[PDB]
Amino acid sequence: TYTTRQIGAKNTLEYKVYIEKDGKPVSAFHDIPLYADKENNIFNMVVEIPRWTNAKLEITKEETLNPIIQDTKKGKLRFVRNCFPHHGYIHNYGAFPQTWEDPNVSHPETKAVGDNDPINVLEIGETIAYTGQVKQVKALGIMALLDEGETDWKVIAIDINDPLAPKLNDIEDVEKYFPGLLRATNEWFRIYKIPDGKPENQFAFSGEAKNKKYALDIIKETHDSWKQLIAGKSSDSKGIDLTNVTLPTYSKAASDAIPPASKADAPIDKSIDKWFF
């Protein structure tokens, strides 16, 4: 059973969420199996950012057991800005554990190296998720984002508990039941860092969302990129912390070393409300 352990107040530098299996911290990167049901391609998704929020929370590569923390740039907490007509993130946002966009090789589909992170997942169901949630999802398709010039696939997925899950099996069903969401998704990932002073991003395949079979192939490829990583068979592991507790860099002590749970959400600066056009 997966739960969460929160250290600190949300929206501060001290905030961390560890995932616990039966009350014991595990690595959110390496210790949650990618497959909840391999035979039926049901994946475990680690939720980082709930729909309609701004705080850029993420599994951190360089801390032990890879807790979810807030991204920073040069000491300042990162909040993704509101880009009209969108409010924060327009998906439940996260990653599949046990995957890696390998930064050391060029991906033939996009002519770019990977962004060094677990492959990202856009979960499109009704219910807003919580940071640190491990949910079970089916993959519907995939989009090829070049994120400041690096391969940054976005899997389009739905919670198997969603009322619509039985009617959603491939990328075409997203167009049926969520008309406009794929367009909005294309726009969002293109422009979301312009308010930060970064360039517009671009997608390979003219922004096309590839179907489920294509997505399963890419996911399995990043999962293999991950098996080379965790084996220490890396030409360059890029400072990632490879410690784990359910599985070399294995270290069963790591789970007891995590501090105990703690605070109410801290205030967010009013500037984060602003809608950019």
Task: Catalog residues that contact a second copy under the rule CB under 8 A.
Answer: 51-52, 84-87, 90, 126-128, 177-181, 184, 270, 273-275, 277
| Residue 199 interface partner, choices a second copy, Mg ion, none, CB cut-off 5-8 Å depending on type | none
Catalytic residue set? 89
Q: What is the 3-state secondary structure (H, E, C) of 46-109?
A: EEEECCCCCECEEECCCCCCCCEEECEECCEECECCEECCCCCCCCEEEECCCCCCCCCCEECC
Give the residue, chosen from 115, 123, 221, 241, that forms a contact with Mg ion under the rule CB under 5 A: 115
The answer to whether the beta carbons of residues 148 and 131 sit under 8 Å apart is no
Give whichever of 152 and 241 is closer to Mg ion, judged by the CB atom: 152
CA distances from 1 to 89, 95, 133 (A): 28, 19, 11
CB 51 → a second copy: shortest distance, Å?
A: 8
CB 84 → a second copy: shortest distance, Å?
A: 6
Count residues near Mg ion (CB under 5 A): 4
CB 181 → a second copy: shortest distance, Å?
A: 7
DSSP 210: B
CB 137 → a second copy: shortest distance, Å?
A: 17
Query: Is 102 near Mg ion (CB under 5 A)?
Result: no
Give the residue, chosen from 31, 48, 102, 117, that forms a contact with Mg ion under the rule CB under 5 A: 117
Structure tokens at 88: 């924060």
Bridge partner residues of 82 (DSSP): 275
The letter for the amino acid at 145 is L
Question: φ and ψ at 250, to 5 degrees?
Answer: -60, 145
Site for Mg ion in 123-152 (CB under 5 A): 152
Burial of 45 (0-12, 13-18, 19+ CB in 10 A): buried
The letter for the amino acid at 264 is A
Give whichever of 205 and 275 is closer to a second copy, judged by the CB atom: 275
DSSP 255: H
Give the residue, chosen from 110, 120, 131, 201, that forms a contact with Mg ion under the rule CB under 5 A: 120
With contacts defined by CB under 5 A, name the span among 4-12, 116-124, 179-187, 246-254 that binds Mg ion: 116-124
Count each helix (H run) and each strand (E run) in the chain, helices first: 4, 18
CA dist 186 and 153 (Å) reads 12
The answer to whether the beta carbons of residues 209 and 143 sit under 8 Å apart is yes
Give whichever of 37 and 126 is closer to a second copy, judged by the CB atom: 126
| Residue 120 interface partner, choices Mg ion, a second copy, none, CB cut-off 5-8 Å depending on type | Mg ion
Bridge partner residues of 42 (DSSP): 37, 138
Give whichever of 180 and 260 is closer to a second copy, judged by the CB atom: 180
Give whichever of 15 and 178 is closer to a second copy, judged by the CB atom: 178
CB 164 → Mg ion: shortest distance, Å?
A: 26
Residue ranges binding Mg ion (CB under 5 A):
115, 117, 120, 152
